[PDB]
Tab-separated table of C-alpha atoms and ligand atoms in Angstrom:
chain	number	residue	atom	x	y	z
P	289	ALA	CA	-73.188	58.202	-39.894
P	290	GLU	CA	-70.121	56.958	-38.042
P	291	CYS	CA	-67.710	59.516	-36.583
P	292	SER	CA	-64.459	57.707	-35.882
P	293	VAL	CA	-61.434	56.246	-37.651
P	294	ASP	CA	-58.763	53.784	-36.549
P	295	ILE	CA	-55.262	54.404	-37.740
P	296	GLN	CA	-51.919	52.632	-37.367
P	297	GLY	CA	-48.370	53.898	-37.714
P	298	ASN	CA	-45.625	51.275	-38.042
P	299	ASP	CA	-41.836	50.751	-37.944
P	300	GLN	CA	-41.618	51.496	-41.672
P	301	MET	CA	-42.826	55.064	-41.143
P	302	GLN	CA	-46.228	54.299	-42.688
P	303	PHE	CA	-49.775	55.283	-41.724
P	304	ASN	CA	-52.337	52.741	-42.923
P	305	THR	CA	-54.450	55.451	-44.555
P	306	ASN	CA	-53.679	58.605	-46.498
P	307	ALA	CA	-57.201	60.018	-46.737
P	308	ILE	CA	-59.763	60.559	-44.006
P	309	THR	CA	-63.347	61.691	-44.562
P	310	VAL	CA	-65.395	63.186	-41.737
P	311	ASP	CA	-69.139	62.989	-42.348
P	312	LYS	CA	-70.754	66.430	-42.350
P	313	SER	CA	-73.381	65.326	-39.797
P	314	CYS	CA	-70.759	64.454	-37.174
P	315	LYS	CA	-70.519	66.917	-34.271
P	316	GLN	CA	-67.414	65.218	-32.877
P	317	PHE	CA	-64.831	62.931	-34.502
P	318	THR	CA	-62.613	60.323	-32.846
P	319	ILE	CA	-59.159	59.153	-33.966
P	320	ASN	CA	-57.881	55.914	-32.477
P	321	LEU	CA	-54.151	55.664	-33.091
P	322	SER	CA	-52.093	52.538	-32.469
P	323	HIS	CA	-48.472	51.460	-33.077
P	324	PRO	CA	-48.154	47.826	-34.222
P	325	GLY	CA	-44.354	48.049	-34.610
P	326	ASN	CA	-41.552	46.961	-32.249
P	327	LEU	CA	-39.535	50.166	-32.055
P	328	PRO	CA	-39.691	52.472	-29.020
P	329	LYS	CA	-41.181	55.960	-28.851
P	330	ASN	CA	-37.824	57.760	-28.854
P	331	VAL	CA	-36.741	56.389	-32.264
P	332	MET	CA	-40.040	55.578	-34.031
P	333	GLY	CA	-42.680	57.611	-32.246
P	334	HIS	CA	-45.861	58.542	-34.085
P	335	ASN	CA	-48.552	61.094	-33.413
P	336	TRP	CA	-51.560	62.080	-35.506
P	337	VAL	CA	-51.608	65.855	-35.908
P	338	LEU	CA	-54.195	67.895	-37.857
P	339	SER	CA	-53.845	71.345	-39.423
P	340	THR	CA	-54.833	73.229	-42.568
P	341	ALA	CA	-52.758	72.302	-45.607
P	342	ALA	CA	-50.979	75.665	-45.485
P	343	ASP	CA	-49.975	75.295	-41.826
P	344	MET	CA	-48.524	71.792	-42.055
P	345	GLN	CA	-44.926	72.737	-42.874
P	346	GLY	CA	-44.781	75.280	-40.061
P	347	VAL	CA	-46.252	72.931	-37.447
P	348	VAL	CA	-43.853	70.146	-38.502
P	349	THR	CA	-40.812	72.416	-38.531
P	350	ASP	CA	-41.405	74.031	-35.133
P	351	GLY	CA	-42.550	70.634	-33.892
P	352	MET	CA	-39.269	68.887	-34.688
P	353	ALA	CA	-37.438	71.650	-32.850
P	354	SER	CA	-39.493	71.304	-29.660
P	355	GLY	CA	-38.152	67.846	-28.803
P	356	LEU	CA	-39.475	64.546	-27.475
P	357	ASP	CA	-40.614	65.889	-24.112
P	358	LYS	CA	-43.085	68.185	-25.881
P	359	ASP	CA	-44.341	65.420	-28.202
P	360	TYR	CA	-42.582	67.262	-31.032
P	361	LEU	CA	-45.052	70.127	-31.065
P	362	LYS	CA	-44.357	73.767	-30.328
P	363	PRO	CA	-46.157	74.733	-27.097
P	364	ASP	CA	-49.423	76.599	-27.585
P	365	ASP	CA	-49.265	76.140	-31.376
P	366	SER	CA	-52.606	77.596	-32.467
P	367	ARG	CA	-52.138	76.064	-35.916
P	368	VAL	CA	-52.771	72.572	-34.529
P	369	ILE	CA	-56.482	71.849	-34.893
P	370	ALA	CA	-56.305	68.547	-33.009
P	371	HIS	CA	-53.738	65.849	-32.261
P	372	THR	CA	-53.113	62.587	-30.436
P	373	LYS	CA	-50.177	62.157	-28.124
P	374	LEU	CA	-46.909	60.680	-29.436
P	375	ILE	CA	-46.689	56.900	-29.040
P	376	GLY	CA	-44.183	54.112	-29.607
P	377	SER	CA	-44.482	50.353	-30.126
P	378	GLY	CA	-47.425	48.663	-28.442
P	379	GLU	CA	-49.059	51.878	-27.281
P	380	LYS	CA	-52.389	53.393	-28.354
P	381	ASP	CA	-54.017	56.804	-28.017
P	382	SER	CA	-57.450	58.226	-28.755
P	383	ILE	CA	-58.584	61.750	-29.203
P	384	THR	CA	-61.995	63.291	-29.873
P	385	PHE	CA	-62.355	66.795	-31.285
P	386	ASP	CA	-65.126	69.184	-32.303
P	387	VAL	CA	-66.167	69.098	-35.953
P	388	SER	CA	-67.013	72.779	-35.487
P	389	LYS	CA	-63.265	73.183	-36.087
P	390	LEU	CA	-63.650	71.761	-39.624
P	391	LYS	CA	-65.213	74.055	-42.226
P	392	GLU	CA	-66.758	72.465	-45.347
P	393	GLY	CA	-64.482	72.549	-48.388
P	394	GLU	CA	-61.359	73.647	-46.519
P	395	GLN	CA	-58.251	71.540	-47.109
P	396	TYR	CA	-56.753	69.789	-44.076
P	397	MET	CA	-53.699	67.569	-43.612
P	398	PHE	CA	-52.885	64.993	-40.957
P	399	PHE	CA	-49.277	63.991	-40.347
P	400	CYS	CA	-46.686	62.749	-37.838
P	401	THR	CA	-44.335	65.409	-36.412
P	402	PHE	CA	-41.648	62.992	-35.251
P	403	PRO	CA	-38.397	64.105	-36.943
P	404	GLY	CA	-38.353	63.068	-40.590
P	405	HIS	CA	-41.687	61.269	-40.526
P	406	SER	CA	-44.102	63.786	-42.072
P	407	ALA	CA	-43.112	63.395	-45.730
P	408	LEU	CA	-43.893	59.683	-45.416
P	409	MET	CA	-46.672	59.896	-42.841
P	410	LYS	CA	-49.248	62.374	-44.090
P	411	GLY	CA	-52.692	62.446	-45.653
P	412	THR	CA	-55.780	64.508	-46.332
P	413	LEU	CA	-58.766	65.033	-44.095
P	414	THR	CA	-61.986	66.393	-45.543
P	415	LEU	CA	-65.573	66.964	-44.543
P	416	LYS	CA	-68.182	65.304	-46.803
B	628	CU	CU1	-44.042	59.047	-36.776
Protein backbone atom coordinates (compact mmCIF):
# COMPACT_ATOMS: atom_id res chain seq x y z
CA ALA A 1 0.00 0.00 0.00
CA GLU A 2 1.12 3.60 -0.37
CA CYS A 3 2.74 5.32 2.61
CA SER A 4 2.61 9.05 1.96
CA VAL A 5 0.18 11.97 1.91
CA ASP A 6 0.38 15.44 0.39
CA ILE A 7 -1.12 18.27 2.35
CA GLN A 8 -1.58 22.00 1.81
CA GLY A 9 -2.13 24.83 4.26
CA ASN A 10 -3.36 28.14 2.83
CA ASP A 11 -3.89 31.84 3.64
CA GLN A 12 -7.38 31.08 4.96
CA MET A 13 -5.96 28.94 7.77
CA GLN A 14 -7.16 25.71 6.12
CA PHE A 15 -5.54 22.30 5.66
CA ASN A 16 -6.88 20.49 2.60
CA THR A 17 -7.62 17.35 4.63
CA ASN A 18 -8.95 16.69 8.10
CA ALA A 19 -8.41 12.93 8.23
CA ILE A 20 -5.31 10.92 7.44
CA THR A 21 -5.13 7.12 7.33
CA VAL A 22 -1.81 5.31 7.59
CA ASP A 23 -1.93 1.77 6.20
CA LYS A 24 -1.00 -0.81 8.83
CA SER A 25 1.59 -2.40 6.52
CA CYS A 26 3.60 0.82 6.22
CA LYS A 27 6.89 0.84 8.15
CA GLN A 28 7.47 4.53 7.44
CA PHE A 29 5.08 7.33 6.46
CA THR A 30 5.84 10.54 4.56
CA ILE A 31 4.05 13.89 4.84
CA ASN A 32 4.65 16.39 2.06
CA LEU A 33 3.49 19.81 3.21
CA SER A 34 3.17 22.83 0.93
CA HIS A 35 1.87 26.41 1.28
CA PRO A 36 -0.03 27.63 -1.81
CA GLY A 37 -0.88 31.01 -0.23
CA ASN A 38 0.81 34.42 -0.62
CA LEU A 39 1.39 35.32 3.01
CA PRO A 40 4.83 35.05 4.64
CA LYS A 41 5.91 32.60 7.33
CA ASN A 42 5.83 35.15 10.16
CA VAL A 43 2.09 35.92 9.77
CA MET A 44 0.66 32.76 8.15
CA GLY A 45 3.17 30.02 8.85
CA HIS A 46 2.01 26.41 8.89
CA ASN A 47 3.55 23.24 10.22
CA TRP A 48 2.13 19.73 10.41
CA VAL A 49 2.53 18.42 13.95
CA LEU A 50 1.41 14.99 15.24
CA SER A 51 0.56 13.92 18.79
CA THR A 52 -1.96 11.79 20.66
CA ALA A 53 -5.38 13.41 20.98
CA ALA A 54 -4.80 14.03 24.69
CA ASP A 55 -1.47 15.80 24.15
CA MET A 56 -2.61 18.20 21.44
CA GLN A 57 -3.70 21.09 23.68
CA GLY A 58 -0.46 20.97 25.66
CA VAL A 59 1.78 20.86 22.59
CA VAL A 60 -0.14 23.76 20.99
CA THR A 61 -0.11 25.86 24.15
CA ASP A 62 3.60 25.47 24.93
CA GLY A 63 4.25 25.72 21.21
CA MET A 64 2.67 29.16 20.84
CA ALA A 65 4.78 30.35 23.76
CA SER A 66 8.08 29.18 22.25
CA GLY A 67 8.01 31.68 19.38
CA LEU A 68 8.79 31.75 15.67
CA ASP A 69 12.48 30.94 16.01
CA LYS A 70 11.58 27.57 17.55
CA ASP A 71 8.93 26.82 14.90
CA TYR A 72 6.33 27.31 17.64
CA LEU A 73 7.22 24.11 19.45
CA LYS A 74 8.60 23.76 22.95
CA PRO A 75 12.17 22.42 22.74
CA ASP A 76 12.53 18.70 23.41
CA ASP A 77 8.74 18.25 23.61
CA SER A 78 8.43 14.47 23.97
CA ARG A 79 4.71 14.71 23.23
CA VAL A 80 5.42 15.49 19.56
CA ILE A 81 5.41 12.20 17.67
CA ALA A 82 6.53 13.78 14.39
CA HIS A 83 6.35 17.16 12.66
CA THR A 84 7.36 19.12 9.58
CA LYS A 85 9.12 22.44 9.85
CA LEU A 86 7.10 25.68 9.81
CA ILE A 87 6.67 27.15 6.33
CA GLY A 88 5.20 30.25 4.69
CA SER A 89 3.96 31.05 1.19
CA GLY A 90 5.64 29.18 -1.65
CA GLU A 91 7.65 26.88 0.59
CA LYS A 92 7.38 23.10 1.01
CA ASP A 93 8.63 20.58 3.55
CA SER A 94 8.67 16.80 3.79
CA ILE A 95 9.12 14.55 6.73
CA THR A 96 9.25 10.76 7.08
CA PHE A 97 8.66 9.05 10.42
CA ASP A 98 8.54 5.53 11.82
CA VAL A 99 5.13 3.87 11.93
CA SER A 100 6.45 2.02 14.98
CA LYS A 101 5.45 5.25 16.74
CA LEU A 102 1.78 4.64 15.82
CA LYS A 103 -0.05 1.96 17.79
CA GLU A 104 -3.20 0.41 16.25
CA GLY A 105 -6.44 1.90 17.57
CA GLU A 106 -4.82 4.82 19.39
CA GLN A 107 -6.25 8.25 18.60
CA TYR A 108 -3.87 10.79 17.04
CA MET A 109 -4.30 14.42 15.97
CA PHE A 110 -2.37 16.51 13.47
CA PHE A 111 -2.47 20.29 13.69
CA CYS A 112 -0.65 23.58 13.06
CA THR A 113 0.97 25.21 16.13
CA PHE A 114 1.23 28.69 14.64
CA PRO A 115 -0.62 31.03 17.05
CA GLY A 116 -4.37 30.68 16.65
CA HIS A 117 -4.23 28.16 13.82
CA SER A 118 -4.88 24.83 15.55
CA ALA A 119 -8.64 25.15 16.08
CA LEU A 120 -9.00 25.65 12.32
CA MET A 121 -6.09 23.51 11.17
CA LYS A 122 -6.44 20.09 12.77
CA GLY A 123 -7.47 16.56 11.88
CA THR A 124 -7.28 12.92 12.82
CA LEU A 125 -4.60 10.42 11.94
CA THR A 126 -5.29 6.71 12.31
CA LEU A 127 -3.72 3.40 11.45
CA LYS A 128 -5.90 1.06 9.34
CU1 LIG B 1 -0.74 27.41 10.39
